[PDB]
Amino acid sequence: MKYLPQQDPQVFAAIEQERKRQHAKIELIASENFVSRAVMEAQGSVLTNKYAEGYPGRRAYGGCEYVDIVEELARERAKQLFGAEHANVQPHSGAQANMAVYFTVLEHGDTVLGMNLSHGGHLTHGSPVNFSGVQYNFVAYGVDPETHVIDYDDVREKARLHRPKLIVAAASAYPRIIDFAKFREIADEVGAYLMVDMAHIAGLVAAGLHPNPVPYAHFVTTTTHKTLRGPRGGMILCQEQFAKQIDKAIFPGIQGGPLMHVIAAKAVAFGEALQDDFKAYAKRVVDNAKRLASALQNEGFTLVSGGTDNHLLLVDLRPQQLTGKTAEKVLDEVGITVNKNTIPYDPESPFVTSGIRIGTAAVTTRGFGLEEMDEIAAIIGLVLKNVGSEQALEEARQRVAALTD
Amino acid sequence: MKYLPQQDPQVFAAIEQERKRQHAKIELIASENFVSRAVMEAQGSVLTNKYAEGYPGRRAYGGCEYVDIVEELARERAKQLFGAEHANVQPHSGAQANMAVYFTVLEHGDTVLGMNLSHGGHLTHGSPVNFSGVQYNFVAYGVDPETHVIDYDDVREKARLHRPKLIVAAASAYPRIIDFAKFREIADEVGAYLMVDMAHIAGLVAAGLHPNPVPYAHFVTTTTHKTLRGPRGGMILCQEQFAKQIDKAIFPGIQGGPLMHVIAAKAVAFGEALQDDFKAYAKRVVDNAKRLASALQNEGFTLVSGGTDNHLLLVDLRPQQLTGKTAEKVLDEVGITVNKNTIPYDPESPFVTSGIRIGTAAVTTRGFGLEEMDEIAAIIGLVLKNVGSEQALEEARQRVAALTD
Numbered sequence: 001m002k003y004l005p006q007q008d009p010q011v012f013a014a015i016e017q018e019r020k021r022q023h024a025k026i027e028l029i030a031s032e033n034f035v036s037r038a039v040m041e042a043q044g045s046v047l048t049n050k051y052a053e054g055y056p057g058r059r060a061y062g063g064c065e066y067v068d069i070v071e072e073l074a075r076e077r078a079k080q081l082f083g084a085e086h087a088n089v090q091p092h093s094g095a096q097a098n099m100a101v102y103f104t105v106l107e108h109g110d111t112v113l114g115m116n117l118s119h120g121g122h123l124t125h126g127s128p129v130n131f132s133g134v135q136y137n138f139v140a141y142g143v144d145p146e147t148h149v150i151d152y153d154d155v156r157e158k159a160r161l162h163r164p165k166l167i168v169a170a171a172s173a174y175p176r177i178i179d180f181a182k183f184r185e186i187a188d189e190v191g192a193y194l195m196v197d198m199a200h201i202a203g204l205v206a207a208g209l210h211p212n213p214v215p216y217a218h219f220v221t222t223t224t225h226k227t228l229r230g231p232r233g234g235m236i237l238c239q240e241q242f243a244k245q246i247d248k249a250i251f252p253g254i255q256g257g258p259l260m261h262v263i264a265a266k267a268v269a270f271g272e273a274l275q276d277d278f279k280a281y282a283k284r285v286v287d288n289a290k291r292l293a294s295a296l297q298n299e300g301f302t303l304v305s306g307g308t309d310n311h312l313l314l315v316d317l318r319p320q321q322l323t324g325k326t327a328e329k330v331l332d333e334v335g336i337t338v339n340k341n342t343i344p345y346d347p348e349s350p351f352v353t354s355g356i357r358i359g360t361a362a363v364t365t366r367g368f369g370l371e372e373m374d375e376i377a378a379i380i381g382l383v384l385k386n387v388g389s390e391q392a393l394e395e396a397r398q399r400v401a402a403l404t405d
Numbered sequence: 406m407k408y409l410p411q412q413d414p415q416v417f418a419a420i421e422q423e424r425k426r427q428h429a430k431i432e433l434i435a436s437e438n439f440v441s442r443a444v445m446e447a448q449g450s451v452l453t454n455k456y457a458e459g460y461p462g463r464r465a466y467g468g469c470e471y472v473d474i475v476e477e478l479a480r481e482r483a484k485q486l487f488g489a490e491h492a493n494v495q496p497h498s499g500a501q502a503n504m505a506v507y508f509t510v511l512e513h514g515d516t517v518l519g520m521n522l523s524h525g526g527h528l529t530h531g532s533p534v535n536f537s538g539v540q541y542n543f544v545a546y547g548v549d550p551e552t553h554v555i556d557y558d559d560v561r562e563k564a565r566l567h568r569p570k571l572i573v574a575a576a577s578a579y580p581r582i583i584d585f586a587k588f589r590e591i592a593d594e595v596g597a598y599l600m601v602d603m604a605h606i607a608g609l610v611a612a613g614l615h616p617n618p619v620p621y622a623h624f625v626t627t628t629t630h631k632t633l634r635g636p637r638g639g640m641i642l643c644q645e646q647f648a649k650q651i652d653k654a655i656f657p658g659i660q661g662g663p664l665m666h667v668i669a670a671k672a673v674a675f676g677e678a679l680q681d682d683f684k685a686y687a688k689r690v691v692d693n694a695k696r697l698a699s700a701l702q703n704e705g706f707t708l709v710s711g712g713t714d715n716h717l718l719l720v721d722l723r724p725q726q727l728t729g730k731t732a733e734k735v736l737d738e739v740g741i742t743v744n745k746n747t748i749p750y751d752p753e754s755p756f757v758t759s760g761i762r763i764g765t766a767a768v769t770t771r772g773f774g775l776e777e778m779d780e781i782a783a784i785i786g787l788v789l790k791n792v793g794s795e796q797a798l799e800e801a802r803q804r805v806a807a808l809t810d
Binding site for chain 1 (some may be wrong): 499
């Protein structure tokens with residue numbers, strides 16, 4: 001940076017602290033990643049200056065010729081990546097992508113069937129303190145109490161009983177492959193639309209490492225910033241038959257001017273995802289998660305569902321008589337970033353929890369491999385088996401530093 | 406830029422076209438401006454990598470120590486600028502800021518009283534194709550048919566008849582000072598909350614050039630990107646009594662993770678707005694608008710309300726027998742960017758209109774003064790009085806180029 005340090009020492013000092021923090025810590029929050037310098041430059045462009053309400057070739061205002069090229073690049077590359085008939089790259093966030101789909105097909109108080117929030121479903125999939133649960137009547141399906149895999153007979157029974165207008169599949173904390181074919185079959189039986197929120201797994205889908213929901217879902221929502229490794233924002237994919245309605249839901253429905261600089265950054269990230277090296281990256285993400293899972297089990301930890309098919313895992317801390325809150329706190333003390341997370345059938349509140357969620361997308365981006373996964377698991381074992389030993393925590397601290405340099 | 410040109414030639418080429426476009430054209434879209442290099446650098450920072458759901462010191466996840474400093478800088482500087490008891494700097498946009506306030510105080514189907522959309526009110530103030538008009542029962546107050554000033558007796562009568570839960574004041578195309586004291590008096594009479602959407606005028610308010618709604622309103626919403634000359638985004642100001650509810654409305658209510666890089670950029674822009682030179686800038690904006698208005702009248706144009714108190718003006722094109730659409734198109738041909746805009750009691754559709762909206766914020770940022778206002782008005786006269794003369798349009802083209810270099 002050249003201008004910010006002189007203009008705003010306070011903001012610059014804090015940004016620099018954050019930059020150094022991202023390098024020093026072992027980042028295991030499953031939803032996080034590190035974007036390229038190209039993506040950041042796009043976000044830092046003059047495109048922030050342009051009001052571009054509407055869509056390419058059909059904008060509210062003149063002078064959109066070049067931002068139109070940018071948005072079309074984003075849309076066409078998204079279609080290349082996921083094989084969708086239509087893309088909307090304007091949603092400001094995952095929240096707004098989901099909001100727009102709900103706005104398109106639901107009326108106030110309609111019934112929606114989503115994944116149990118304490119079993120892996122997201123806040124925007126029906127929390128009573130979120131617009132989703134306030135505006136619509138959400139009911140939930142669960143995972144099997146033993147396998148922690150989605151119970152598709154429960155999905156079916158809930159759908160048949162409650163007759164939802166919309167079924168939502170996908171999750172913030174589900175470590176296994178989701179069967180979209182079965183979701184669509186159930187949706188078809190009850191005459192419901194199917195929406196898949198692939199936010200967490202979008203990069204894996206792009207890389208052919210998780211089944212693609214696009215062929216099975218009426219609507220696919222996602223963030224651009226998780227496994228897709230793009231800027232912070234949202235996106236909607238859908239079949240051509242819903243394109244007009246979806247676009248109208250985003251604008252003039254729920255948003256105004258799009259963030260054209262972020263959309264440029266989306267295009268850049270989609271360009272990166274189309275490359276061969278992104279596919280290799282994504283395989284390492286999944287390979288690393290499986291290795292980390294196995295290594296954690298070797299340390300004596302129990303994992304939700306007994307492992308992982310994707311980028312993330314959930315440690316069930318009950319065997320160690322620890323809460324997720326306690327684990328999160330002590331790992332923070334040694335420079336490992338995780339989050340407490342409810343496990344299925346958790347006896348604790350979502351503010352305490354019996355689990356920690358871990359993902360490998362960020363550490364894989366930094367170049368960590370199988371050997372580093374082994375060491376991360378060993379450090380976690382050292383910490384969680386010795387929460388009362390300052391010497392153990394200091395050793396962990398040093399081993400974390402050794403990994404990040 | 407260093408990395409984007411190599412990584413993504415297509416995106417870079419389009420960005421460069423847009424950058425050159427912003428320099429070449431005379432930008433008179435009233436909602437637009439040019440941000441500083443410092444603001445852009447903040448947006449282009451690694452802060453995009455951080456999930457920071459929640460609020461400073463009360464986040465969902467760990468590691469937020471430094472983004473907390475950034476968000477608090479934004480909040481405290483906003484409070485300095487506007488004298489508000491509370492700030493929420495997380496809204497992704499003006500749309501989401503408004504959405505959050507509505508979510509806080511209204512139930513589905515509640516009555517809201519806003520400014521007539523064809524008289525200057527915004528899409529989010531009750532359009533039937535916007536969430537506002539779909540989710541809530543909007544009624545409208547109008548301006549006087551002769552003066553085009555808000556009819557406060559009409560505000561009062563509509564409020565007393567319809568008994569709205571909320572009254573919205575503020576506008577996207579109102580060229581005169583809004584009387585917030587009178588709005589609050591009317592709100593008090595009917596027991597309604599008052600929300601002021603100061604998006605357009607926020608920079609002028611910060612500079613003491615428009616009365617501050619903060620002392621009179623329960624809630625003040627704004628964008629950060631218009632006269633405030635900040636990054637693209639939203640903000641809510643409110644009294645302490647609503648702080649908890651407002652914060653909950655943004656998260657977990659209507660949004661998820663905030664855009665921490667944009668919030669950094671907000672802090673930077675608020676820092677700039679606190680400086681003496683921003684106050685001088687804002688005075689030039691208003692001085693320039695008044696000069697441009699006067700100069701347009703000298704050319705024989707009729708202005709809505711007969712002039713301006715702020716950054717913007719509306720030309721009533723009926724005397725010239727032109728539509729706003731026709732005017733917008735021909736001005737585009739010569740390199741002047743305006744938008745067609747409905748005038749009060751417009752005989753035309755919002756897709757055709759009898760007016761053009763013009764603002765001086767952007768040209769003032771580029772250093773234009775009174776002499777340039779005279780010339781802009783003269784070029785507009787030349788064009789609109791000679792729409793069928795290619796020689797006239799070519800002269801205009803050359804005079805526009807002379808202004809931008």
